[model samples]
Target: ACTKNAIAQTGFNKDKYFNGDVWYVTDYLDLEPDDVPKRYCAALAAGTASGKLKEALYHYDPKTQDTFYDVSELQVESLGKYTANFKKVDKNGNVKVAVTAGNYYTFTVMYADDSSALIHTCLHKGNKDRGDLYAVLNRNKDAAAGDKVKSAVSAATLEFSKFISTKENNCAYDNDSLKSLLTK
Candidate 1:
C-alpha cells in the first residue's frame, strides 16, 4: 500500500515549480520493487492554463518499448500538495482514455528549485493502493541530480544510491508534445 506521507518543501514556491516547463526524471525510486522495471523513463510538464493548473506526463519502458502519455488537471491540497485527475492521451494530446473516477494521484513536492526538483507520488487505481514513487528531476534530461536535491532526498530519509538512473538507458522525450499537452 502507499505508505509514505512525504513532507512538502517548507515555504514552497508554487509559481516557479509550475513555471510552464518540462522536467525529466533523471532517477527514480519505487517502494514496490517490481513496478520500477515497467517505468524505465518518465517526464512531466507542469503549467497553468486558463487559470487552472495542469500537468502533462510521459512514461516509457525500455524493455518493451512501451510509451504512454497523460494530462492531469491538478487540485491543490495545500501549499505544495495536489490531487490530480489524469486522462491517458497520445503524445499529440489525443485522449485515449477519458478521465473518470479513480483516475488520480497525490503529488507532494519534497523539494524544488529553478533547475532541479525532488517529488513524490502515490497513484491509486480503484480500491487497491500502490507504492510510493520518488523522482529526482532536472530541467535538462541529461543533467545529473544536483547536490541540493540530493540533500533533500536524504532529508526525506530515502537512500539516494537505490534510485535507478534514467541516463543509462537510451531514453528520449518529445519536449514539444509535452509542452503542447499542458493546455489540452
Candidate 2:
C-alpha cells in the first residue's frame, strides 16, 4: 500500500498568513509608512505657466510668497502620515496677493506602499488667484491612467476656479492654494 504524505497544519493562522494578492504582505507590514517618502516628486511640464509647480517647490521670496495657500490635512493623511506649515506672507509683513515672475511653492506628502506616491500642490507665489494646482502621483498606475488624470484636470479647471471665489477662505495661505490645486 502506498501512503501519500499528509500536509502539516503548521498552526499558522490561514487568515493571517494567506493573502490573496502578492502585494498584501507589504500592506500588512505597513511598508514605507512615512507620509513623504524619498521618492515623492513632480515636474511642472505645462500649465498657466511652464515649470510653475517646480518653481514653487524650491524658491520662496516676497513676490512668490503671495500665492501660498492652504492644504488638506485629511487628504495628506490618506496618502501617508505627515503635516506641514508654510510662510504665508511677504517681507512687508503682510498677507497680500503677490504676482510676478518667480518660483511658486510646493507642499508634498510622499509614501511607499510598494514603490512611492506623491501627493502635492502648488501656490501662485504672488497672485490673488485662489485657484491653485494639485496632483496625486501613483507609481503603480499605467501610462494611460496618468493621461486620464491630466485630461480630468483640463476638463474641470474652470469649474474649480469658480468654487474658491471668496477671499475669506484664504486665511491659511496653503488652504486656499490646496483647494484650488486639487479642484481641477
Candidate 3:
C-alpha cells in the first residue's frame, strides 16, 4: 500500500506583509511670534528601515539663529512628535503637511480614499539632527507594512524622486511619468 501527503496553503498574508522600508520626508516651518511673516518651510527625504523608533527632533533658536528638523525630536520635547495620516488618489495628488505636533496647527487636505493613508510623525521645536530623524522614521513601520503601504507611498516617492532627478518643478510626476524617468 502507498500513502500520499498533502501540503497546506496559507495564501498571501497582507497583514503580515510589509516592506519595512519607508521613503520619508520631514518638513519644517520657520516663523517668529507676532511677526505675521511668511514661514519658511523645508523638507528632506531618506530611506528608512524598521528597527529604531527614537523619534528625531528639530528646533529653531531665534536667539542664536539656529534651526533643526527631522524625526528624532520625538525624544526631546516628547510633545511635538506627531503623525499626519491621510490619503492620496494619484502620485502628485498632494502629500500635504499637517502639523500634528500642537493645537497651533490644524490638519489640512481632504481624504479621497481608504486605500491610501499618509503618516508624518514629526516634532516642532528647534533644528534637530536629520540623521537622528532618519533613524526614527526608519524604525517606525514594519517591513511587511511597507508592501501594504507601497501602492500609496511608493507612488509619491517615485514622483518626488523624478521631480528632483529632472529640472521640472512645475511638471507633475505620476506613476507612469516616474517610470519614464528610469528609461531616460
Candidate 4:
C-alpha cells in the first residue's frame, strides 16, 4: 500500500515548474485502480503563495460526472519531491473538507520541461494507502504526449502504452478558477 519511492528529476527547476500555470493530465497510469478509475481527467496549478508552495487540483470523472477540487500546501522533501496535505474545496476555493491527520499525498516530479512533465504520487487517506500513480502532464490541455515526455516515462521504467489518454473523454477544464485557487 503506497510503498513506491519514485526518483525525482536530478536537477528539477522548481521556479520554472511552478510558474503558476495549469498542467493538464493528458494521460495517467495507476498501479492500484480501485480509487481512481482508468478514465479520468485531472489538472493542477502550482505556485508560491505568500512564499509558501501551493497547488490547486481539479479531478473529473467524465463517465461518472464526479468532480472535485483541492488546495494543498506543499512541504519540500527534496528538489523535486514534496509532501502535501489537501483541503477539499469548491472551484472558488471555499473549503468544504478541511485537511485532517492521515490524509496527505507525496509527490515527485520524475521529469519536466517547459511544455510537458511526468509525475508520480502516492496518496494516503484514512486507513487506505493508495498505490502509486503516474501522470503525463502538459501545458496545453489538448497536447498529446510527445517524444520527450515519452522518453521520460521510459526513463522512469514505465511503459507509455499503459497510460490512458484523457483526450477522448470530452474533458473540459476551469482554468480561471484553478488559477485563483493558488492563493486560497
Candidate number achieving the greatest lDDT relative to the actual structure: 4
Q: lDDT tens digits, residues 1-184, model 2?
A: 1111212222323222111111100010101233122222221111122212111111112223333222111112222222232333332224343333432333333222222222234333444322323343333322122344334334433222222111222122222232233212
Judging by lDDT, tell me the better candidate of 1 and 3: 1
> Compared with the true structure, what per-residue lDDT tens digits does model 1 show for residues 1-184?
7888888999889999998899999999999968658449899999998999999999999889989999999999899999999999999989899998887899999999999999999998777566899999999996988899999999999899989899888889999999999999
Q: Give the Å shift of residue 89 in candidate 1.
A: 0.7
lDDT of 4: 0.92
Q: Per-residue CA lDDT of candidate 3, range 91-132, in tens?
A: 222222333433121111111122222332222222321111
- Comparing candidate 2 with candidate 4, which one achieves the higher lDDT? 4
Question: Could you tell me every candidate's TM-score relative to the true structure?
Answer: 0.96, 0.22, 0.21, 0.97
lDDT of model 1 at residue 39? 46
Ranking by TM-score: 4, 1, 2, 3
lDDT: worst 10-residue window of model 2:
21-30
- Location of the lowest summed lDDT over 10 successive residues in candidate 3: 129-138
Lowest-scoring 10 consecutive residues by lDDT in candidate 4? Answer: 31-40
Q: Any runs in candidate 3 off by more than 4 Å, and if so which? A: 1-37, 44-50, 54-65, 70-184
lDDT of each: 0.91, 0.25, 0.23, 0.92
Q: Which scores greater on TM-score, model 1 or model 3?
A: 1
The C-alpha stretches of model 2 lying farther than 4 A from their native spots are 1-103, 110-114, 128-132, 138-184
Q: Candidate 4 — which pairs collide?
A: none
What are the per-residue Cα lDDT tens digits for candidate 4 across 1-184? 7767999998999999988999999998888757577778999999999999999999998999999999999999999999999999999999999999888999999999999999999998888778888999999997988999999999888999988888888889999999999999
Off by over 4 Å in 1: 127-129
Query: What's model 2's TM-score?
Result: 0.22
Candidate order by lDDT, highest to lowest?
4, 1, 2, 3
Model 1: colliding residue pairs: none
